[PDB]
């Protein structure tokens, strides 16, 4: 039953870059609330000012380690500062700084766990996340000999010089001049996981190295935040109103929310799909809201289409999640033309709010979006996307309502509690 878990993560609310902080906080809270004792080690990144607990030696120098302790029942959070762990640049500063920071975090973690073990038993498992925490995971397994579980949220696919493993005290893990840290993490782990069954398959070229000890464990979504109980009026009124607030009268509405970049989130695919459609007769019963920022080229292309058409709105400012929740709760479709997707949180947030997804058939999107709950399409293919948008527009029959309902039912089976229960089996 009850386990004591040591969870190593490189970000953790309130200190976040993208969604990882929130996902790790969610997991920890879920584990805790099932009754398990959960200790979290994570860097301070400059936000906390902890107690000195002793020195470590990193790259020929001494570093005084600091620790801030937050405790809430079975959930125990240790934020470790000292040297590079004080940089506010979570994934820095610079590439070299980052990796030195990750080594620093590895030695600092060992120090802390020794310090703690003076007064409590060893944890039953160490669960570390992403490549940044591999020095720490590998050192803890090595020194304290406890079962390790390695979870990959996103494969960085990059190598480090052996120098770093040597300096970390992990020479035995460095039999070549250059070493893939993700591969090392899978290698020393008793169990490896990633956050979706379709990403595990999309990356089987990597993950097959761990046949026999590899599985997937989905992430969750917070549907207590993402639901419609926060919105008023009916969906028609809201849409009628939003569109109008954008200069447009009613029409079936598609939304994209994403950074603007090449070969990732796929706004370029969508901007092209739109051009492809901007000559059909039905392009006129369609409204597009494009939200994000990044590549200037991609920005201009979007601003230009906005100008060319009184049918396209573009938002490069930053939207609060309260407001995004409003958008999802009022548009007809959300479009998710990713080139790859470890999990698919946006699809879930949208689905929790009755928006019907049209997504690339990549990674977790293939898991999440089943055939009664959204439309899937080849990634990278503007004509396939433009076509799907067309199908959707013809879909417009008040049995979009069947879809919407299926979307909600579905998205909500992705609870964090189920993730946690799943990780617990894996721990055991
Ligand atoms: O099981 C032992 C190790 O397993 C894992 O190692 C991985 C590496 O992380 C991968 O990067 C790769 O190793 C490559 C290596 O990256 C590359 O430099 C090259 O190595 C040559 C080397 O240049 C040359 O000097 C000579 O000694 O031969 C080497 C091998 O021919 O190619 C390597 C071979 O793939 O693959 C291994 C496979 O495991 C894990 O990362 C380690 O921590 C673990 O100890
Ligand atoms: Cl992200
Ligand atoms: Cl040390
Ligand atoms: Cl195979
Ligand atoms: K010194
Ligand atoms: K299976
Ligand atoms: K994701």
- The domain tally of the chain equals 2
Q: Are 300 and 428 in a shared domain?
A: no
Q: Are 371 and 420 in a shared domain?
A: no
Q: Are 180 and 240 in a shared domain?
A: no
Q: What CA dihedral angle connects 264, 266, 267 and 268, to 10 degrees?
A: 110
Return d(Cα 200, Cα 193) in angstroms, integer. 8
Q: Are 150 and 299 in a shared domain?
A: no
**C-beta of residue 257 within 8 angstroms of C-beta of residue 334:** yes
63 beta partners: 56
CATH code: domain of residue 280? 3.40.50.2000
For residue 347, give its domain range: 221-414
Distances, alpha carbon 406 to alpha carbons 227, 256, 414, in Å: 14, 21, 13
187 close to ligand 1 (CB < 6 Angstrom): yes
Q: Which residues contact 254 (CB under 8 A, 6 or more apart)?
A: 286, 287, 288, 289, 331, 332, 333, 334, 335, 358, 389, 392
Nearest CA to ligand 1 atom 24: 176
Q: Which residues contact 48 (CB under 8 A, 6 or more apart)?
A: 68, 79, 81
Q: Which residues contact 134 (CB under 8 A, 6 or more apart)?
A: 102, 128, 150, 181, 182, 184, 185
- The ligand 1 atom at the shortest distance from the C-alpha of residue 170 is 43
Q: Which residues contact 229 (CB under 8 A, 6 or more apart)?
A: none
Nearest CA to ligand 1 atom 20: 176
Q: Are 276 and 234 in a shared domain?
A: yes
Q: Are 160 and 54 in a shared domain?
A: yes
Q: What CA dihedral angle connects 174, 176, 181 and 183, to 10 degrees?
A: -100
Q: Are 260 and 353 in a shared domain?
A: yes
Return d(Cα 403, Cα 185) in angstroms, integer. 41
- Among the bound ligands, name the one nearest to the CA of residue 207: 4
Nearest CA to ligand 1 atom 39: 183
Q: Are 164 and 235 in a shared domain?
A: no
Q: Which residues contact 230 (CB under 8 A, 6 or more apart)?
A: 322, 325, 329
- The ligand 1 atom at the shortest distance from the C-alpha of residue 179 is 9
166 close to ligand 1 (CB < 6 Angstrom): no
176 close to ligand 1 (CB < 6 Angstrom): yes
Return d(Cα 173, Cα 165) in angstroms, integer. 7
- Residue 295: closest CA among 257, 262, 337: 262
Nearest CA to ligand 1 atom 18: 178
175 close to ligand 1 (CB < 6 Angstrom): yes
Residues belonging to the chain: 428
Nearest CA to ligand 1 atom 44: 173
Angle between helix 416-427 and 20-33 (nearest 10):
70
Q: Are 297 and 245 in a shared domain?
A: yes
Q: Are 229 and 326 in a shared domain?
A: yes
219 close to ligand 1 (CB < 6 Angstrom): no
Q: Which two tokens stand for residue 81?
A: 């500062």
- Residue 70: closest CA among 98, 42, 46: 42
Q: Are 57 and 179 in a shared domain?
A: yes
The alpha carbon of 357 and the centre of ligand 4 are apart by a number of angstroms equal to: 31
Give me the resolution in angstroms, 1 decimal.
Answer: 2.6
**C-beta of residue 44 within 8 angstroms of C-beta of residue 80:** yes
**Residue 315, Cα to own-chain centre: how many angstroms?**
22
Q: Are 280 and 314 in a shared domain?
A: yes
182 close to ligand 1 (CB < 6 Angstrom): no
79 beta partners: 42, 68
Nearest CA to ligand 1 atom 38: 183
């Amino acid at each position: 039953r009850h386990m004591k878990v040591l969870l190593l993560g490189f970000e953790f609310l309130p200190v976040k870059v993208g969604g990882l902080a929130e996902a790790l906080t969610a997991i920890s809270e879920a584990l805790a609330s099932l009754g398990h004792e959960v200790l979290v080690f994570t860097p301070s990144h400059g936000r906390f000012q902890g107690e000195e607990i002793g020195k470590i030696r990193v790259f020929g120098e001494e570093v005084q380690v600091k620790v801030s302790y937050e405790e809430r029942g079975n959930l125990r959070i240790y934020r470790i500062g000292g040297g590079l762990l004080d940089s506010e640049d979570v994934y820095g500063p610079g590439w070299d700084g980052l990796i030195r920071k990750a080594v620093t975090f590895g030695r600092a973690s060992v120090l802390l766990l020794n310090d703690l073990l003076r007064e409590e038993p060893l944890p039953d498992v160490v669960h570390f996340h992403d490549w940044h925490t591999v020095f720490a995971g590998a050192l803890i397994k090595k020194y304290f000999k406890i079962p390790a579980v390695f979870t990959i949220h996103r494969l960085n696919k990059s190598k480090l010089p052996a120098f770093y493993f040597h300096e970390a005290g992990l020479s035995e893990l460095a039999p070549y001049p250059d070493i893939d840290p993700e591969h090392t993490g899978g290698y020393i782990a008793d169990i490896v996981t990633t956050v979706s069954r379709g990403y595990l398959i999309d990356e089987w070229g990597f993950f097959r190295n761990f046949e026999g000890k590899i599985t997937y464990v989905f992430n969750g979504i917070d549907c207590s935040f993402w639901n419609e109980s926060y919105l008023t009026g009916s969906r028609d009124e809201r849409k009628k109103s939003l569109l109008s607030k954008f200069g447009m009268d009613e029409g079936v509405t598609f939304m994209f929310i994403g950074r603007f970049d090449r070969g990732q989130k796929g706004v370029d695919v969508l901007l092209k799909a739109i051009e492809i459609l901007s000559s059909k007769k039905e392009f006129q019963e369609m409204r597009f809201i494009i939200i994000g920022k990044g590549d200037p080229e991609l920005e201009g292309w979007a601003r230009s289409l906005e100008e060319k058409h009184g049918n396209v709105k573009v938002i490069t400012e930053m939207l609060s999640r309260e407001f995004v929740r409003e958008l999802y709760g009022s548009v007809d479709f959300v479009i998710i033309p990713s080139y790859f997707e470890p999990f698919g949180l946006v699809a879930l947030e949208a689905m929790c709010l009755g928006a019907i997804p049209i997504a690339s058939a990549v990674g977790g999107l293939r898991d999440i979006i089943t055939n009664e709950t959204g439309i899937l399409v080849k990634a990278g293919d503007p004509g396939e996307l433009a076509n799907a948008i067309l199908k959707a527009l013809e879909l417009s029959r008040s049995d979009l309502s069947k879809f919407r309902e299926n979307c909600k039912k579905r998205a909500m089976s992705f609870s964090w509690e189920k993730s946690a229960e799943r990780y617990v089996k894996a721990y055991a």
